[PDB]
Write a protein that binds this ligand. Structure first.
Ligand SMILES: O=S(=O)(O)OC[C@H]1O[C@@](COS(=O)(=O)O)(O[C@H]2O[C@H](COS(=O)(=O)O)[C@@H](OS(=O)(=O)O)[C@H](OS(=O)(=O)O)[C@H]2OS(=O)(=O)O)[C@@H](OS(=O)(=O)O)[C@@H]1OS(=O)(=O)O
Length: 142
């Protein structure tokens, strides 16, 4: 499905390129967040950039904001809460990206192992992301 620059929707799929098992972050209609081996309409995200490297991420099809609780668990919420739904984004020296809670420090990741982004150490491979341009034709979104 060859798409033009004016037909991919500006949507991005976050892929755990360096993890042992790589997936695209998926936000389901019910708010559950997991991984999809290949791009799906539910892994298509709108990543809104703000100042100072902060971002607000929304799953286009689920209509939910990516949020995180105090334990680092991520989920999709229909309601935006600044204490849980805004992340600090940053590109590491190795070229991959990480997203972490400015209040809880935990890194966004797909599995049960939650790790805090702390100064003086490197984040684990499973928490590193690569932004992949959406390749799913827009007719599939709704
Ligand atoms: O926190 S831990 O130190 O215990 O590590 C857990 C995370 O380790 C990974 C790899 O991390 S990475 O190196 O940064 O990429 O892999 C480990 O767990 C997976 C998933 O296990 S699970 O029980 O099904 O959930 C194992 O993969 S698999 O064999 O099940 O397919 C890994 O085994 S293997 O090396 O692939 O053979 C296992 O590695 S190890 O034994 O700890 O060395 C992350 O999983 S990953 O994201 O799928 O790559 C783990 O993250 S997780 O949140 O725990 O799932």
């Amino acid at each position: 499905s060859p798409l033009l620059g004016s037909s991919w929707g500006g949507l991005i799929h976050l892929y755990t390129a360096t993890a042992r098992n790589s997936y695209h972050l998926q936000i389901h209609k019910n708010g559950h967040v997991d991984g999809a081996p290949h791009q799906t309409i539910y892994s298509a995200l709108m990543i809104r950039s703000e100042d100072a490297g902060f971002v607000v991420i929304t799953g286009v099809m689920s209509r939910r904001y990516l949020c995180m609780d105090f334990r680092g668990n991520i989920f999709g919420s229909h309601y935006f809460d600044p204490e849980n739904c805004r992340f600090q984004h940053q590109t590491l020296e190795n070229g991959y990206d990480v997203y972490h809670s400015p209040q809880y420090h935990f890194l966004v990741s797909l599995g049960r192992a939650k790790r805090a982004f702390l100064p003086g150490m490197n984040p684990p491979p499973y928490s590193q992301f690569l932004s992949r341009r959406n390749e799913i034709p827009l007719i599939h979104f709704n």
